[PDB]
Symmetry: D2
Subunit: 156 residues, 4 copies
């Protein structure tokens, strides 16, 4: 079934959305620790009115639940030599969700699933392993569990 | 001596949060002016399109009126500099950067909101107006010898 | 008695020294945590051949043990609106040794004392409260104890 | 002929050296501008007594002049997903010397040549295009000159052994 935004409208591919915590402000690029600059991790900003860095969703025009999708940050500047596409830091113990994935490759595929109670609330799951958060340098950072509830706000 | 209006045409209120958005990239934010100064912070225009800016509250020494002494203070849950979030002029610098750390009750921190050019709800900060200069992180607010702004209410 | 450098020579005021851990490289400015940029703390660099940021010692020309001295970083550029003089962050729980002190004021007075093993090895003590270290953002940061952080003074050639 | 260090001793491969400006302190990693974090550029530190970040030299045990060598930073921490080996940023207009090269590949080969009068003073040349410097974010950054291999805009260097 269709993934809905905060206005209850269906999510469209190639459309800009803030991924906002459903449970501070939105989700943003920040480095995971002082040992890694690139690629970047995804942290919840502690600043109350910051909407997040927008993302576009792509499918290998509706975004449906339980289907393979790829999340890519939308930014006019990017200081890392790799992509803005979310992926899993396989090497790390923490299993941080990091940038630099290939949006056409399976290493970058997540699934948007419904999350408990409230409407328009979702979780990211990787194939069942869900995306959660861990305390890190800049605040809560997205990690692959062995769930971090999110909403999608349309960028007006 | 008429009311300053926000982007919705509503009058500005003191002790209310507003994004100061360029009228002319996203809103106005704290960033350091160059690699020689960390504190206090300057005010730069973010190059990221949907960043609203760091909110400010306006205070008067409840309406904010044009051509009256006001003080602009950043609203932030964290502040890593040992001084205030109140805008003021970096007197020492050649560039005359608008910097944080002013005293909101003191005259060193008084600006006046004046009408700018054509469009409604467009203003400037002032007979020396606030403009911008190229700096480290992008356009930084400076005192001229005008940088047009709108006030968006933080909903 | 005179404080000696790593060459066994007496320390002189207004002379540049690296304060090197006696126990990684020398002592350097870094911020203590992500909530404070200025003033700066003093951390031990984890990079093996970095000598530290040099300091000059001042007295309110010989530097003697158990006498009031003030430590001031020597740097051509300084991005904080305060001094390069070491002092104690009174407000913090950790009691970080921070920059921004007044070198003529008592808030900035430390005493160089002999430390245990080996010649030319010293500790900083504040009036007895000694200077130790704590884990912080960038690595071990100098703090005032209630574990003394042993130091040598290397002359800057 | 052998490249000599600041003590006049011949340079050895797999040995740590500070590359110090012959002409501020030594050469260090810093980003080139606010648009690039990785890979890193090479800047001259403006802090007088900072020796530089040490490098080891490798040859595809003596380091000789006018022979292909590769310069690799020696560092306990490295936050970029690529190597510590110097190479040329081909894409950039400035032609910054950047990290992330392959030390066994030709993209990373420099040649150490004599510079001017004074002994133990050298330049880096790429095959004749010499390494110079340009004003950048953190200070003078190493760049590849266009040059007919002269010492005019070449960035003169000494090698200090890390004791
Ligand atoms: C808020 C400002 C600030 C911050 C965050 C730092 C942070 C640091 N300083 Mg310091 N420093 C400052 C102000 C600051 N300093 C000032 C004003 C001076 C006088 C000019 C100095 C003089 C100084 C000296 C002489 C040295 C340091 C060193 C260090 C590092 C100690 C950690 C380490 O040994 O390995 C970690 C080191 C790495 C290089 C790994 C990279 C770490 C991650 C990816 C973050 C990138 C850091 C980046 C450059 C941030 C800008 C801060 C910059 C001043 C370093 C750390 C990067 C030591 C050092 O290591 O130099 C590089 C050192 O020798 N400092
Ligand atoms: C290495 C790269 C890097 C780093 C370190 C950061 C860091 C951060 N990003 Mg991000 N970001 C990046 C890349 C980076 N990002 C890229 C490439 C983009 C796309 C262009 C973004 C887009 C982005 C957006 C849209 C937002 C952030 C935000 C944040 C902040 C989240 C935590 C917070 O709530 O701060 C709140 C606290 C502060 C801002 C004060 C910080 C405390 C002091 C001043 C520390 C100063 C740094 C110190 C010297 C150490 C330097 C080390 C560093 C080199 C690792 C944090 C400052 C959010 C934010 O808060 O914006 C400011 C936010 O909305 N990011
Ligand atoms: C030393 C202190 C300091 C520094 C260096 C900065 C720097 C910056 N701030 Mg600010 N800020 C500060 C203090 C600081 N701020 C404080 C105390 C607050 C109140 C909490 C804020 C609140 C704030 C907000 C709300 C916003 C900023 C934004 C910005 C950016 C404006 C330029 C841009 O559009 O880049 C965009 C380009 C990038 C993010 C990628 C550049 C790659 C560089 C080379 C690496 C930079 C890493 C990291 C962001 C630097 C660490 C410093 C950190 C404090 C931000 C710039 C990165 C805007 C922003 O862009 O958010 C991130 C923004 O919306 N600031
Ligand atoms: C992106 C990563 C990064 C960045 C930005 C830097 C930047 C710098 N490095 Mg390097 N370095 C790195 C990675 C990095 N390095 C790595 C991975 C290593 C190996 C572990 C090193 C090893 C190294 C050594 C050994 C040395 C440096 C030094 C320097 C400085 C050279 C300019 C100078 O003389 O300042 C002098 C002036 C100051 C240090 C005071 C300026 C303080 C400013 C205001 C801090 C700015 C913070 C602000 C939030 C903006 C940050 C932007 C950032 C996000 C890009 C500069 C701060 C030299 C140095 O000077 O020591 C720190 C030095 O000796 N580097």
């Amino acid at each position: 079934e269709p993934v809905k935004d905060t206005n209850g409208n269906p999510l469209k591919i190639e459309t800009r959305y803030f991924i906002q915590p459903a449970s501070g402000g939105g989700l943003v690029p920040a480095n995971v620790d002082l040992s890694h600059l690139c690629p970047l991790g995804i942290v919840r900003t502690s600043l109350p009115y910051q909407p997040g860095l927008p993302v576009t969703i792509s499918t290998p025009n509706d975004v449906l639940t339980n289907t393979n999708i790829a999340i890519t940050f939308d930014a006019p500047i990017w200081p890392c030599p790799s992509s803005k596409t979310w992926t899993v830091d396989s090497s790390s113990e923490e299993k941080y969700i990091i940038t630099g994935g290939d949006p056409k490759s399976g290493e970058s595929f997540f699934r948007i699933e419904k999350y408990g109670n409230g409407k328009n609330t979702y979780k990211l799951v990787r194939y069942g392993k869900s995306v959660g958060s861990t305390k890190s340098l800049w605040g809560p950072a997205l990690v692959l569990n062995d769930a971090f509830p999110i909403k999608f706000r349309e960028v007006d």
